[PDB]
Design a protein around this ligand. Sequence first.
Ligand SMILES: [Mg+2]
Ligand SMILES: [Mg+2]
Ligand SMILES: [Mg+2]
Ligand SMILES: [Mg+2]
Ligand SMILES: [Mg+2]
Ligand SMILES: [Mg+2]
Ligand SMILES: [Mg+2]
Ligand SMILES: [Mg+2]
Ligand SMILES: [Mg+2]
Ligand SMILES: [Mg+2]
Ligand SMILES: [Mg+2]
Ligand SMILES: [Mg+2]
Ligand SMILES: [Mg+2]
Ligand SMILES: [Mg+2]
Ligand SMILES: [Mg+2]
Ligand SMILES: [Mg+2]
Ligand SMILES: [Mg+2]
Ligand SMILES: [Mg+2]
Ligand SMILES: [Mg+2]
Ligand SMILES: [Mg+2]
Ligand SMILES: [Mg+2]
Ligand SMILES: [Mg+2]
Ligand SMILES: [Mg+2]
Ligand SMILES: [Mg+2]
Ligand SMILES: [Mg+2]
Ligand SMILES: [Mg+2]
Ligand SMILES: [Mg+2]
Ligand SMILES: [Mg+2]
Ligand SMILES: [Mg+2]
Ligand SMILES: [Mg+2]
Ligand SMILES: [Mg+2]
Ligand SMILES: [Mg+2]
Ligand SMILES: [Mg+2]
Ligand SMILES: [Mg+2]
Ligand SMILES: [Mg+2]
Ligand SMILES: [Mg+2]
Ligand SMILES: [Mg+2]
Ligand SMILES: [Mg+2]
Ligand SMILES: [Mg+2]
Lengths: 79, 50, 64, 96
Amino acid sequence: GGSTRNGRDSEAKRLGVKRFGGESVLAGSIIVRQRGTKFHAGANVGCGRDHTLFAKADGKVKFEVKGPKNRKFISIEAE
Amino acid sequence: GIREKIKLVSSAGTGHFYTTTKNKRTKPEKLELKKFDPVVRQHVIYKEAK
Amino acid sequence: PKIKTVRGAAKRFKKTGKGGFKHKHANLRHILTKKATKRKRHLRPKAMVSKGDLGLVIACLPYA
Amino acid sequence: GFEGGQMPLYRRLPKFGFTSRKAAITAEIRLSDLAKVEGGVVDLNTLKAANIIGIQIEFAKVILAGEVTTPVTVRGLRVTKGARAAIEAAGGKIEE
RNA sequence: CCAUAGGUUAAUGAGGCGAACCGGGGGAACUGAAACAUCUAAGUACCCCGAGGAAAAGAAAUCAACCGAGAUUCCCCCAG
RNA sequence: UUUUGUAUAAUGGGUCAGCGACUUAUAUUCUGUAGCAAGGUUAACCGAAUAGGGGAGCCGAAGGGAAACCGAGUCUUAACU
RNA sequence: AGGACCGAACCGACUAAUGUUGAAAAAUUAGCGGAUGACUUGUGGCUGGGGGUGAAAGGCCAAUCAAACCGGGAGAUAGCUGGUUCUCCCCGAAAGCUAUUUAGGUAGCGCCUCGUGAAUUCAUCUCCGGGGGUAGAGCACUGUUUCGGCAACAACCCGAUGCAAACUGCGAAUACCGGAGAAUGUUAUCACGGGAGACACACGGCGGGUGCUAACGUCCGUC
RNA sequence: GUAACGGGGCUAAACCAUGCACCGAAGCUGCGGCAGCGACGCUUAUGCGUUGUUGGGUAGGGGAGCGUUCUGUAAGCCUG
RNA sequence: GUUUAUUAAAAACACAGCACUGUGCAAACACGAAAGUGGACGUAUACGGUGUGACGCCUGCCCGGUGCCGGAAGGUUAAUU
RNA sequence: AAUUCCUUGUCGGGUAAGUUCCGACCUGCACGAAUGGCGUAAUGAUGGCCAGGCUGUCUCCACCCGAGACUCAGUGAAAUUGAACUCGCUGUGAAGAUGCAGUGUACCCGCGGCAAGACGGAAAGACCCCGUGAACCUUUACUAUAGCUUGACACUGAACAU
RNA sequence: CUUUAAUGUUUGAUGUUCUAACGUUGACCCGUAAUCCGGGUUGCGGACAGUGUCUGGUGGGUAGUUUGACUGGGGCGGUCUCCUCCUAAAGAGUAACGGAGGAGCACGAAGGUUGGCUAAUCCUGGUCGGACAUCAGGAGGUUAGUGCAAUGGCAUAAGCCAGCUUGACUGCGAGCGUGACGGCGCGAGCAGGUGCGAAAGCAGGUCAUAGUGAUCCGGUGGUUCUGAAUGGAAGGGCCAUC
Ligand SMILES: [Mg+2]
Ligand SMILES: [Mg+2]
Ligand SMILES: [Mg+2]
Ligand SMILES: [Mg+2]
Ligand SMILES: [Mg+2]
Ligand SMILES: [Mg+2]
Ligand SMILES: [Mg+2]
Ligand SMILES: [Mg+2]
Ligand SMILES: [Mg+2]
Ligand SMILES: [Mg+2]
Ligand SMILES: [Mg+2]
Ligand SMILES: [Mg+2]
Ligand SMILES: [Mg+2]
Ligand SMILES: [Mg+2]
Ligand SMILES: [Mg+2]
Ligand SMILES: [Mg+2]
Ligand SMILES: [Mg+2]
Ligand SMILES: [Mg+2]
Ligand SMILES: [Mg+2]
Ligand SMILES: [Mg+2]
Ligand SMILES: [Mg+2]
Ligand SMILES: [Mg+2]
Ligand SMILES: [Mg+2]
Ligand SMILES: [Mg+2]
Ligand SMILES: [Mg+2]
Ligand SMILES: [Mg+2]
Ligand SMILES: [Mg+2]
Ligand SMILES: [Mg+2]
Ligand SMILES: [Mg+2]
Ligand SMILES: [Mg+2]
Ligand SMILES: [Mg+2]
Ligand SMILES: [Mg+2]
Ligand SMILES: [Mg+2]
Ligand SMILES: [Mg+2]
Ligand SMILES: [Mg+2]
Ligand SMILES: [Mg+2]
Ligand SMILES: [Mg+2]
Ligand SMILES: [Mg+2]
Ligand SMILES: [Mg+2]
């Protein structure tokens, strides 16, 4: 009674954990809702509407911490 | 609802047009705002919006 | 007796350079005002059959 | 095509109709031909009597198939600018 | 009144059987649509009348497409 | 036999002998095999009838486009991308 | 005189027993009701099926009736039940997901088989690079909870003790993703194409919701 | 109906710890034999000897076969 | 008195009586595509339908809803033009 | 109460004792006036209760006469039936065992008797659920339709008034 | 010629009367020593009635069907699509009639950009001002705020204020995520043109995740795509859209 329902999939997480093939624009992190769980940085950025961490130019993924008070900050150099 | 589907028209002699909605209930003033007209390939004034 | 082709189906498909049939996208002929022009701008072009249900298509059009 | 019980695939997908009703009377000649058009001058017809067009046809294109060799002069027909070349490459001739 | 109607006679012909095929009059439902009304089954089954060795059809108020073809009927294609 | 599971107290059979159920026609798609090959093949019909004749026609050598059209390109678009 | 009384024939059928592979597909026996009446009976006739007939039970219409019997449409349909016949050899599932007037049926995917291609593909162990908020712990935060410290009986706050799936200022094992390496593995791996079956699972271990940390209970994950 | 060691029966035939011996399966080994894939020897069409390894199996997929009736090979062969 | 022939004989059906209602006769109604026929060679003290069910004392209040009866002035309104 | 759930209501009568019965009360779960209310002589193979007579209905059976039953001679069925070398107990087990484990017991075969088990025989459960099954039935379910009925035109004309 | 009235006329509306269709289950005659039927005569009725086609109403009298599923048996109740959290075992994903709460929209500004700003709460002091209106100072530090649930996020603010605007643009799209599929989501960059800014640059709707409906059949605008002898047209396609 009045108890049930539920959203659905909405994966939103790391799909390009650490270094990877890193194509012109994979994802490496689609953890929506977030902006601080994974901050836009490095050769890549994007951070689309749903905050999905873009991932520009091809290369390797990094996953840093640089910046006052934690602050993840995903960056991707060239591999 | 209360939001009618409004349609913006080009001031140009072309039939091209845009589409959206408006709250006529409180905005009985026909809207205009200028948009791109593919036909004339030039940004012009678009009108009609209850 | 010659196999009859599923008319309704042969009106939404069209064999391509090979196996594929390529069809028409849906959600592009009704209530559009509230649809991203982009979304639709990516619906106008034709698209091949998903290769998953394609098998069925190549059954409704025996003479395709 | 009885997709379980749900809406079939040949259903959820729109239908883009319309049929030439003219392409049926339009043939497609190939460069490999002509050399077998029985003699010279590839008349608007000829190929018909040369079994390679169709008594119903009315329009046709020369098109390149990768052959020509013998000099031929197509008549009462069309041809691609890529064929009206290889055709002349062997002393051809366009009607029009 | 005429005249018809009706009556008698005679000469002819019909009647009833029939297997299929044939023309015509009337005409289902199960079934399929994974339900069911449109639709399908099917102008089928079935009933009725009529005729022949065949029946029916047939010498364009037909097609064609600006070239032309030339009654009807049956076969193969066109084409699922 | 059906079941997650049956010695099962779940189904079927008294026994024997004979009969008893994936066929056939046309179509379409693969696989194998044979013929020929950018060509392969005839239908009806004729018939000196399994020949031979008949290529009406079907399939393939060209595709893209909704089509007009164009064509190893073509659509999309003003468009060069 | 009387749809009057008692009572045989005659008509009927309230009770019990017996019969129940009967003597009998409704009877026998002992009682029982009407018996000049809407009585009872012979003979012949008329009502025909969605129709008849009916002092009305859906009763009767040939041992048949909420639509007779015979023949035909007809091999109706049957996602259901049953049954499916000689031998050997290789491989070998599923009882899941997602849809479905769908739930014991189906269809795409997944798992089987067979064929054709493909790169040092795929697996384990080692080392490197990764994000992680579970277990646990903790109580700043969200709530909750004690005990002290002032409150014309107590918040707040201070210190001291705990509790949490929807608490977290902490935080594993580990799983997973990627990179490189050796060995081993009769390509194990991927794509495509011919044939599927299967979408009732059961128990035991571990982590759990539900249940009574009940059930050979129920519902997921995983082996 | 003994019915809460399977029974008999056991004070150790119970239990704790230590250690050795043995029994025990279609597991593993040995010997002989069969089929599939890989290697050798070889010898090489062929082809086998040795060796490595594989061979539970419902739905179901794949590959090989046996036999029954009728046609040709049949005016042949077997046959009183 | 009647009834479930073959598990129910009854408190069930039937009945005389009552009431409502239809019917002016080519009656209403019913069988029948129709002709025709029953009603009835009857004619409102007659015939059909429905409910109640001897007889006695009785049978109250509600017409809002539904049906039926009457009115139809006006509003809406088919084919047709 | 053929209507009352509470309900064996409460009271009275009958009994030695009465969830029934009869007479009352009224708190009518949820009577009620022609889908008639309340009475009613007579009638009834009608429902309930009481009594007198009567008795094997019973306490509690006993004997007796016949038809079978049993024996002999003649004739001669049936359902059922996977195969049988067809014991008890306790446990096990697809969860209530002749067939499994353990144990106990038991010379082989008939005849007459009884029915506790063979989840005995009999009928592809009638209850229950399921099937995008069936049939009749109802209705302001839907869609149609005979019949009834409305008007227009046709068969269908001549005049006058307004 | 109109705005309007007698004459004729045409025509509709009823209302009368007539006969001659039409009816007669009145009376005779003949067929005929018949009750049917037919013809004739007469009476009554009379363009009515009745019938055919069409048409509105009525129509369980009859007919064909429909009348969902999940469900700790069925029914009743509840549920059926979408979003948020827990269950979910630290990648994704996972069930129950498990525990909780929301969506079916709202904004021409609540969008874009440029420039600027920063809370809640308490303490102290202050006209009417008190529990809390506005003012001042201090502590405090995302405990505020966020159009609406929840989770995540937000100070370089995604929070607040103002100026200028319409990028809530058109065509495309490297490449990815997520689905059995139909789909759905993210998207740098390219071309055309815009807006804001001195400029670098930002802008393809809102802090993000709900605010939704496939196909068919059509409706509206556009288009030299098609258009059955030809030119048109109807109709069809295409793009936009209801
Ligand atoms: Mg030809
Ligand atoms: Mg059907
Ligand atoms: Mg001419
Ligand atoms: Mg079972
Ligand atoms: Mg058995
Ligand atoms: Mg046999
Ligand atoms: Mg009497
Ligand atoms: Mg007697
Ligand atoms: Mg008597
Ligand atoms: Mg008789
Ligand atoms: Mg009978
Ligand atoms: Mg049939
Ligand atoms: Mg059958
Ligand atoms: Mg559906
Ligand atoms: Mg914990
Ligand atoms: Mg299923
Ligand atoms: Mg299942
Ligand atoms: Mg399971
Ligand atoms: Mg279980
Ligand atoms: Mg051994
Ligand atoms: Mg095997
Ligand atoms: Mg009597
Ligand atoms: Mg009786
Ligand atoms: Mg009565
Ligand atoms: Mg009465
Ligand atoms: Mg009354
Ligand atoms: Mg009493
Ligand atoms: Mg009553
Ligand atoms: Mg004897
Ligand atoms: Mg037992
Ligand atoms: Mg006995
Ligand atoms: Mg039994
Ligand atoms: Mg059964
Ligand atoms: Mg009905
Ligand atoms: Mg039907
Ligand atoms: Mg159900
Ligand atoms: Mg997870
Ligand atoms: Mg995990
Ligand atoms: Mg928002």
